[PDB]
Design a protein around this ligand. Structure first.
Ligand SMILES: Cc1cc2nc3c(=O)[nH]c(=O)nc-3n(C[C@H](O)[C@H](O)[C@H](O)COP(=O)(O)OP(=O)(O)OC[C@H]3O[C@@H](n4cnc5c(N)ncnc54)[C@H](O)[C@@H]3O)c2cc1C
Ligand SMILES: Cc1cc2nc3c(=O)[nH]c(=O)nc-3n(C[C@H](O)[C@H](O)[C@H](O)COP(=O)(O)OP(=O)(O)OC[C@H]3O[C@@H](n4cnc5c(N)ncnc54)[C@H](O)[C@@H]3O)c2cc1C
Ligand SMILES: C[C@H](N)c1ccccc1
Ligand SMILES: C[C@H](N)c1ccccc1
Lengths: 341, 339
């Protein structure tokens, strides 16, 4: 097979690795390439806060819950490994804060040590009356992309700077199988009105004393439209906006203020933190992830496309389960052609 | 009333602040001075790992448990304050690891969210079979001393870099009350054969990805003679030796190795951590803290000494309850003098 993966964000690179690992040994002429028009540090993935945590409500497609779980167990299994930090991975503990009682999240047993906050814990965060504590994992987008591209490179997977104009051009360039991991821009290659940009702005800050994630929720204003603080490997991400439908890629002043003042209110020690950068990214928001096979005809030959996009504000959290599912669908492509695992 | 506090480590400065904050308003004149022969960054306190956690067995003296508790409640209540990190203070969560089941510690309800580790959690730590999780606080010795000295200075408490040769000399120089916070060197001013150095060596490392404390225990080799990892504000402290009776203030090779290999085995990501410094300090080990009043008699008057030393490897953990108790004893002194 000639396989072209389109996209070098978390979804693209994880999928490319997962396919290569699973099928290199049984399919000798396996030729896997990555095409993309943005690589680290210039992908949405690089701008991600870095935390493993699904949305608070159950997803429309319950398969997503398994993909999240598989991703956690996968990442957890590297803790104890000498290279966990080089992969962008380290354990972190933290708080989820609410202005009123809410049900437990579906993921409460996936994380480690989930429990309700006690009154003394609530005293640390005055504006809030209810919440959770748990241990989870940091997965830093930037570092993980760098790890994946090294792992891919060693396995002979080749990377190409290419702005793909259509699936047609890639098929006629020889690809038997196209894996579509184009994130929020997938609509360019095939219209998909269910896919919308989730505009998130963040402030990165030097405040190494903060060891815990702190995520506040506002049930009325929707997910991640409430202050959040996430310690990274070297810096801390401050957030608080996540606006669907907004394609403006420039930082604005009003969101900066919302983030800074919301987070300084949550964590007043931030007064002494040095601003290191400010960024805006677009979460690929969709009612559910698109992860499915599609057959396209160009001339007399069929081309196989597998889509993997629309992971909203949880791409890091879910990526590995999705990569595994794409590999499963790839297996079926092979078996449809009398090829064997 | 001239009060000379001897010592500028955590014990000395906390005590001086507590006395001054308690009596400045009601006693004129009150003159509080600090004498010491080392200030930050040169005290044992500056070398401390930074974590709030008492020893695993309860203390002989039941007052010590309360002092620990008062210290936790004091420090916790600064979380929310804009200056907590400038004080050297931040919350941390972490793991206490054992090769076998042990009883719960007496302090289990003082910390936040104490529980046993689950089977899943234990897999993260291949070498260990049982443990605890809880949330506590980092109190960085260095930063806390800088904070206390600023708070003291602003309130007009004066410092003097001075080696005290005897209590007598300080009394004769005009002190009505001496607070003895000389840590492991208290024996120089008054022999105390119960007081021994607890020699601890540590390695400081840049490994900012480590967000949790990890403390292992070896029931066979004694407290803190087993690998420990404690994230500080800017650096991580790696430890694993604590020998009573050893007065060598120089780093040695064996302890470096014990610490590095123990901790690299616990936390193999340490392979990429840059060494920042290696240090040795002396914990003031005593069967129990000495915190008591004593009357001395030189010249034409009595001078009151209040001792506050012998806090072993838990001086940061216990300091504030001790400072409070000394301020109380000071109150008694004042009333006996009809102030
Ligand atoms: C501020 C913010 C914080 C977030 N924090 C988190 C978090 O803490 N945890 C979490 O799980 N998720 C988080 N997310 C969610 C989100 O899913 C991730 O950011 C994720 O990066 C999306 O992955 P992706 O690979 O599909 O897209 P991207 O990372 O955007 O990568 C897409 C790739 O496709 C390429 N591409 C697209 N179109 C073409 C074309 N026509 N030709 C060639 N190449 C093309 C791009 O160049 C790029 O290489 C966050 C999102 C935002 C905005
Ligand atoms: C490696 C290590 C790690 C530790 N980690 C922790 C931890 O994580 N948590 C915790 O709670 N505890 C910890 N401890 C214990 C803690 O460091 C000590 O209990 C504490 O610092 C002792 O405080 P101190 O003020 O009594 O002594 P010091 O900080 O040693 O202060 C002694 C002071 O007295 C002065 N002085 C002495 N004699 C004279 C004299 N004759 N004239 C003038 N000045 C004099 C000195 O100059 C100095 O100012 C640790 C100890 C060590 C060695
Ligand atoms: C951390 C959380 N996944 C997030 C999502 C969108 C924008 C900011 C933060
Ligand atoms: C963390 C603990 N208090 C400790 C004591 C002595 C040496 C290292 C660590």
């Amino acid at each position: 097979m000639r396989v072209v993966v389109i996209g070098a964000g978390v979804i693209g690179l994880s999928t490319a690795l997962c396919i290569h690992e699973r099928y290199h040994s049984v399919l000798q002429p396996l030729d896997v390439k990555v095409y993309a028009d943005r690589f680290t540090p210039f992908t949405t993935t690089d701008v991600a806060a870095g935390l493993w945590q699904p949305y608070t409500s159950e997803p429309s497609n319950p398969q997503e819950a398994n993909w999240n779980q598989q991703t956690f167990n996968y990442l957890l299994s590297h803790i104890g490994s000498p290279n966990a930090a080089n992969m962008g991975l380290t354990p972190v503990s933290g708080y989820n804060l609410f202005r009123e009682a809410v049900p437990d999240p579906y993921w409460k047993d996936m994380v480690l040590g989930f429990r309700k906050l006690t009154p003394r814990e609530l005293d640390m965060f005055p504006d809030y009356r209810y919440g959770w504590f748990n241990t989870s994992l940091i997965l830093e987008g930037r570092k993980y992309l760098q790890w994946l591209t090294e792992r891919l490179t060693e396995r002979g997977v080749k990377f190409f700077l290419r702005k793909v104009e259509s699936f047609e051009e890639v098929a006629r360039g020889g690809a038997d199988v196209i894996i579509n991991c184009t994130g929020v821009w997938a609509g360019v290659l095939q219209p998909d009105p269910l896919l919308q940009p989730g505009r998130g702005q963040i402030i990165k800050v030097d405040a190494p004393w903060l060891k815990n994630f702190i995520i506040t929720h506002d049930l009325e204003r929707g997910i991640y439209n409430s202050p959040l603080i996430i310690p990274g490997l070297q810096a801390v991400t401050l957030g608080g906006t996540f606006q669907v439908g907004n394609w403006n890629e420039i930082n604005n002043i009003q969101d900066h203020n919302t983030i800074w003042e919301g987070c300084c209110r949550l964590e007043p020690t931030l007064k002494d933190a040095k601003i290191v950068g400010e960024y805006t990214g677009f979460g690929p928001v969709r009612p559910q992830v698109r992860l499915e096979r599609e057959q396209l005809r160009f001339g007399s030959s069929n081309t196989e496309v597998i889509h993997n996009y629309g992971h909203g504000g949880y791409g890091l959290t879910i990526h590995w389960g999705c990569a595994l599912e794409v590999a499963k669908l790839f297996g079926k492509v092979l078996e449809e052609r009398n090829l064997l695992t």
